[PDB]
């Protein structure tokens, strides 16, 4: 039930191992970052609405801080998520390579020589 917490050489509380630096960082115009900024903007608008302030124009510095904080956190969140998926793929490929007898390559037949059953529609 705990897949990758016990992976060897895993430092407890880094949130970003040094090996992650070999991966391309997400672009600053990543659509996920844009969505995080939109979430921050929505948080700012809801904050204005709750405090009975003009929703769109009241706090400009507060809305800017909201958007900036959301984007800042989302950048590192995306980095960690991409690194974790890279680890998953790396481990999967290494395990497949090291166990050829469990992932055999069987010759594939062409469809002219595979017999499929025909089910008429009527």
């Amino acid at each position: 039930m705990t897949m990758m917490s016990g992976r060897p050489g895993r430092v407890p509380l880094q949130f970003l191992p040094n090996e992650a630096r070999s991966l391309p960082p997400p672009k600053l115009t990543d659509p996920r970052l844009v969505y995080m900024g939109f979430l921050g903007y929505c948080s700012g608008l809801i904050d204005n609405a709750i405090r009975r302030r003009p929703v769109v124009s009241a706090g400009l510095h507060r809305q800017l801080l909201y958007v900036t904080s959301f984007v800042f956190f989302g950048y590192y969140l995306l980095k960690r998520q991409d690194y974790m998926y890279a680890l998953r793929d790396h481990d999967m490929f290494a395990y497949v390579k090291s166990h050829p007898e469990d992932f055999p390559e069987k010759d594939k037949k062409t469809y002219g020589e595979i017999l499929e059953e025909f089910h008429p529609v009527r």
Partner: protein
């Protein structure tokens, strides 16, 4: 769930007390120090799933040292046979097993 602050900081908040083979005061050993030492060194670094299978012999020895079930079973069988043999008079206990032994230092 389990944030290993101790391992990150190298603190040893409670790891000194987890096992019986770990630095007792005045070097007083546990009653099953060697069995646990063997079982720990067998299972180190191979993961919990493998430790159960490739180190079952060491764990069985450690558990036998801890609870001594098989030893008690053997002693009970021996004493039952001894009682059965005496009740019919076929076996007689030796003098050194009846309180008439010659003690040695």
């Amino acid at each position: 769930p389990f944030f290993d602050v101790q391992k990150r900081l190298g603190l040893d908040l409670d790891r000194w007390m987890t096992i019986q083979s770990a630095e007792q005061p005045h070097k007083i050993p546990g009653r099953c120090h060697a069995f646990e030492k063997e079982w720990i060194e067998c299972a180190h670094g191979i993961g919990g799933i493998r430790a159960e299978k490739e180190c079952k012999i060491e764990f069985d020895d450690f558990v036998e040292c801890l609870l001594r079930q098989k030893t008690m079973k053997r002693l009970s069988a021996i004493k039952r046979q001894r009682d059965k043999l005496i009740k019919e008079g076929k076996y007689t206990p030796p003098p050194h097993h009846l309180g008439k032994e010659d003690p040695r230092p």
